[PDB]
Ligand binder design. Structure first.
Ligand SMILES: Nc1ncnc2c1ncn2[C@@H]1O[C@H](COP(=O)(O)OP(=O)(O)NP(=O)(O)O)[C@@H](O)[C@H]1O
Ligand SMILES: OC[C@H]1O[C@H](O)[C@@H](O)[C@@H](O)[C@@H]1O
Ligand SMILES: [Mg+2]
Length: 280
């Protein structure tokens, strides 16, 4: 669809984005389905279509809410959830509903849908995830980083499983730009652990207390760092999974280089995933 238009369901053609009056008069809210530091999300209906209605939680998270909306408007593509309508005044966003929901439900979903509970389909799932990262790193709005991914469940929370079994990014609230000398930080609070990239950890030791003003900024390689965790989750433990992990060890090891500049690009990881896929 051209910029500003959407298509879903049995729509053969593209319709303009809905506005405040259409959301106020034509959408019937059905039941809560998610939440949400920024949005409260409701399964809803609009004509024959199930849609998601995301409502701003607190007029204080407002700034994060419009960022995701602006990201959503400019980043429409096969990799992002379809934007249907929005209303800034009401702090609402309308998008295509995906009844399989969060990527977290993958294992639950794959038991009906076991024509696709194979290693081949899971690895293709993993290739779609990397394709999104590659798209975000080369987006209409420049290189964008999927900042809100400090642990596996939270990272998966941000993507949806479509009924065809593609993946799309959904939550784009935290999407800083990397560029000029423009680097980024994922929040203002100290990050800990091994899921975040090591350059996201405080670098100055226990004898220097954390000060965000001293925390050095970083770039889109923090997304590369997290690829093997998402890929491994998607492969799961069905026949062939460990065979695929074996062939992915080294590309995944390059994804965990302590030195960010040594990690591959998303395009490199995708390329290697494809070669491994067709070889097996
Ligand atoms: N279009 C949709 N179709 C189906 N389920 C959805 C849809 N949008 C959101 N949900 C569900 O509701 C949740 C909404 O979370 P999300 O949009 O990430 O809100 P949020 O406030 O930004 N959460 P956070 O990650 O803390 O910033 C998702 O993780 C899904 O479980
Ligand atoms: O919840 C929003 C906030 O969450 C975490 O602190 C980080 O991952 C940030 O990038 C993000 O801005
Ligand atoms: Mg989220």
């Amino acid at each position: 669809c051209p910029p500003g238009y959407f298509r879903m369901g049995r729509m053969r053609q593209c319709s303009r984005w809905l506005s405040c009056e259409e959301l106020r008069t034509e959408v019937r809210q059905l039941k809560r389905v998610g939440e949400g530091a920024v949005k409260r999300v409701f399964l809803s209906e609009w004509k024959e279509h199930k849609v998601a209605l995301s409502r701003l939680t607190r007029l204080e998270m407002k700034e994060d809410f419009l960022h995701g909306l602006q990201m959503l408007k400019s980043l429409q593509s096969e990799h992002v959830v379809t934007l249907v309508g929005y209303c800034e005044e009401d702090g609402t966003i309308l998008t295509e509903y995906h009844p399989l929901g969060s990527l977290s439900n993958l294992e639950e979903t794959l038991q009906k849908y076991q024509d696709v509970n194979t290693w081949q389909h899971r690895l293709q799932l993993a290739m779609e995830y990397v394709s999104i990262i590659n798209y975000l790193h080369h987006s209409p709005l420049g290189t964008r980083v999927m900042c809100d991914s400090n642990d596996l469940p939270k990272t998966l929370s941000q993507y949806l499983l479509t009924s065809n079994f593609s993946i799309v990014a959904n939550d784009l609230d935290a999407l800083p730009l990397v560029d000029s000398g423009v680097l980024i930080k994922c929040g203002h609070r100290e990050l800990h652990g091994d899921f975040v990239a090591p350059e996201q950890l405080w670098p100055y030791g226990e004898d220097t207390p954390f000060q965000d003003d001293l925390m050095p900024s970083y770039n889109e390689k923090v997304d590369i760092w997290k690829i093997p965790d998402v890929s491994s989750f998607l492969l799961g433990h069905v026949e062939g999974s460990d065979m695929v992990r074996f062939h992915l060890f080294d590309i995944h090891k390059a994804c965990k280089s302590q030195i960010p500049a040594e990690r591959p690009t998303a395009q490199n990881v995708l390329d290697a995933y494809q070669r491994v896929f067709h070889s097996l």
